[PDB]
Each structure stands twice: as C-alpha cells, then as structure tokens.
Amino acid sequence: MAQASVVANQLIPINTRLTLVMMRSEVVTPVGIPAEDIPALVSMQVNRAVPLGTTLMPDMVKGYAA
Numbered sequence: 001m002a003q004a005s006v007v008a009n010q011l012i013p014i015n016t017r018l019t020l021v022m023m024r025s026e027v028v029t030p031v032g033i034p035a036e037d038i039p040a041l042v043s044m045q046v047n048r049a050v051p052l053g054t055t056l057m058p059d060m061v062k063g064y065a066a
Contacts, residue, residue: 001028005025006024006025006033009021010052011052012046012049014049015046018041019042033058044064047060
C-alpha cells in the first residue's frame with residue numbers, strides 16, 4: 001500500500017467546513033480521498049460526523065468531485 005488518504009485528525013462534527021488542522025495523510029485500507037487533495041478540501045463541508053482516525057471518503061464531502 002503506498003497511496004495515502006485523507007484521515008480525520010480530530011472529530012469533525014456534521015456540517016463542519018474542513019480546515020487544515022482537521023486533516024492528516026495516512027496509508028490506510030480502504031483508500032479514501034487522495035492525501036494530495038487536502039488543499040482542495042479546505043472550506044468544504046462534510047455531510048456527516050467524521051470520528052477521529054476515520055478515512056474521508058468522496059461521499060462524505062458536499063461538492064467533492066475529483
């Protein structure tokens with residue numbers, strides 16, 4: 001496994017706009033949103049509560065298409 005995904009660095013409450021301290025990069029399985037996309041995720045809103053350590057998936061971010 002070499003692809004890193006975006007993983008929640010703290011609990012992200014439902015409907016929170018993402019900030020840089022909320023997102024770390026980690027190689028996890030299954031793969032989620034590419035770690036490379038963390039720039040493009042700032043200020044985007046999550047549509048569900050994301051617990052600490054959870055992989056951010058495409059379907060959890062409102063407006064994410066990439």
